[PDB]
Structure 1
Amino acid sequence: MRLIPLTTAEQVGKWAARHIVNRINAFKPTADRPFVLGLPTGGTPMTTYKALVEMHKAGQVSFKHVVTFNMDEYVGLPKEHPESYYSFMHRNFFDHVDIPAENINLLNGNAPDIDAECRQYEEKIRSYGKIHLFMGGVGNDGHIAFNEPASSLASRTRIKTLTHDTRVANSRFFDNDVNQVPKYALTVGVGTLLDAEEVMILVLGSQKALALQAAVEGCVNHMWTISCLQLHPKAIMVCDEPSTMELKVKTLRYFNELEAENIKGL
């Protein structure tokens, strides 16, 4: 695993964005061989999407041959509602880059047959073969996407009943109304995430401290899903300063020294 210890969210975004850009340019995607990118929504990926857009406008990347798959979507919320994941993604990323519509994959929270919808999402991915880089965040309890703790490390895209905590936390977007927030959501599984060739988790804020610690210093265990990324062939944790509160001083010094060359510039 790699731990990129940075100070700010702006830095994390720049670093994460640059890593994606580099992976893409090195892959050199074509129409027959696109670079498949897994993506998250929310406040965490904010600075990364912002950096990605900048680099693109600076002419450093083209998403012309990048295929994206998003982690989740609200069930029963209309696509153009400003708080659907589809809306967040276009407003924050797609509206400013050259990615073709056929290359954008998002779950249909309004599909009549949910199981079929999820099943097909999994199928669309396999049709491409594999996701080259799946970017995501982590819950305060180490959970991934809408997967609950103790999820099978082999779980797949499926619908989930949002937890009270998730509700309140998102009630703010449904303007502080936890009553507004949808009841269910469609989410990729942990297996879906782990099948990615490379996984990059964005860790921001002191409230992620315990999860960062479980991921980096703790032992592999299913209650803290994030900890199983220790078994993944290519995982990276990109974090800010506040999130490092639960790590030993030496652990942080280790990675800060080991990755010093890679964090200059961002």
Structure 2
Amino acid sequence: MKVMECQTYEELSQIAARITADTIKEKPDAVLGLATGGTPEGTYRQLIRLHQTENLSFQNITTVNLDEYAGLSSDDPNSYHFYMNDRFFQHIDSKPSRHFIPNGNADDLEAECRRYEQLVDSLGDTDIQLLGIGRNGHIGFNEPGTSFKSRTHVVTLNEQTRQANARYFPSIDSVPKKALTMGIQTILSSKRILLLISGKSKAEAVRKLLEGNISEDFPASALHLHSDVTVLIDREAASLR
């Protein structure tokens, strides 16, 4: 696991965008695994800037997202479909049909998860997977106690996760209770993992991650099993290391 300490969130975001662009340009038709939340927002902004300043083309890319909330339609402003379109897809020259995200408004959520797992396998897995980390070590919405063999599945969100994400909702009472997420094994199948971590709130998780103990009680510790992980950490997140 290669750890790079970044002086600022802006530097983190520039570095992450550059690694992502490398992936896009390394081969005609890359498959990118993407993530939402606060942490990658700068990375998306910088990727869009590269589209303008370095003539970066997304014409041939395919993407897969980590997760989606259960019961939210794609036009719901808190859906991850909406996030991805707003922050990224609307601003680039990709083919919209090659952006894949779990359907939180499928009739049968268990069946949707099986079909999504099958879709990801059929793409040949990802060339890179962007990740964030929860305060509790979660990756995707794979909470403490998740098997390292897990595949795409329906989960019940921990209270800490709903607490953290309420900032994006009108109130806590609007935060969904369940989500669909790529599993840990799904994530580990990527060729390359890029874990982004920012802010003092994640300083406890960074400490635990770098110490190297492996247990299902800290999901991100599964990344110690992968052959090509880069972790970008800004100064605030590195403060309790």
TM-score, normalised to structure 2, is: 0.96
The match for 1:236 is: 230
Secondary structure in structure 1 of the residue aligned to 2:237 = helix
1:225 and 2:222 aligned = no
AA partner of residue 199 (structure 1): I
Number of the residue aligned with 1:142: 137
- Structure 1 residue 13 and structure 2 residue 3: aligned? no
Which residue of 153, 174, 184 corresponds with 1:190? 184
- Give the partner amino acid of 1:19: I
Partner of 1:246: 240
SS of aligned partner of 1:172: helix
SS of aligned partner of 1:73:
strand
- Range with bigger deviation, 190-199 or 224-233: 224-233
1:46 and 2:41 are equivalent in the alignment:
yes
Q: State whether structure 2 residue 173 is matched by structure 1 residue 159.
A: no
Is the 1:109–1:185 Cα contact (8 Å) retained in structure 2? yes
Instruction: Determine the structure 1 residue equivalent to 2:204.
Output: 210
Check conservation: 1:155, 1:192, Cα contact below 8 A.
Answer: yes
C-alpha deviation, 1:60, in angstroms: 3.8
Does structure 2 retain, via aligned residues, the 8 Å contact 1:9–1:204? yes
Match of 1:114 among 95, 109, 112: 109
> What displacement does 1:41 show?
0.5
Q: Deviations over 1:120-169 (max 9, x none)?
A: 11111111112110001001111111111121111011111122222222
Asked if 1 retains the 8 angstrom alpha-carbon contact of 2:212 and 2:224, the reply is: no
Match for residue 3 of structure 1?
A: 3
Give 1 or 2 for the bigger CA radius of gyration. 1
Matched to 2:186, the amino acid is: T
Partner of 2:100: 105
Q: How many residues end up aligned between the 2 structures?
A: 241
Q: 1:23: how far off?
A: 2.0
Is this contact kept in 2: 1:155–1:191, CA < 8 A? Answer: yes
| Runs of 4+ with >6 A deviation | none
SS in 2 for 1:143: coil
Q: Is the 8 A contact 1:215 1:228 kept in 2?
A: no
C-alpha contact (below 8 Å) 2:81/2:101 kept by paired residues:
yes
Tell me the SS of whatever aligns to 2:120.
helix
Aligned identity (percent) is 39
In the superposition, the TM-score normalised over structure 1's length comes to 0.87
Q: Distance in 1 between matches of 2:203 and 2:95?
A: 37
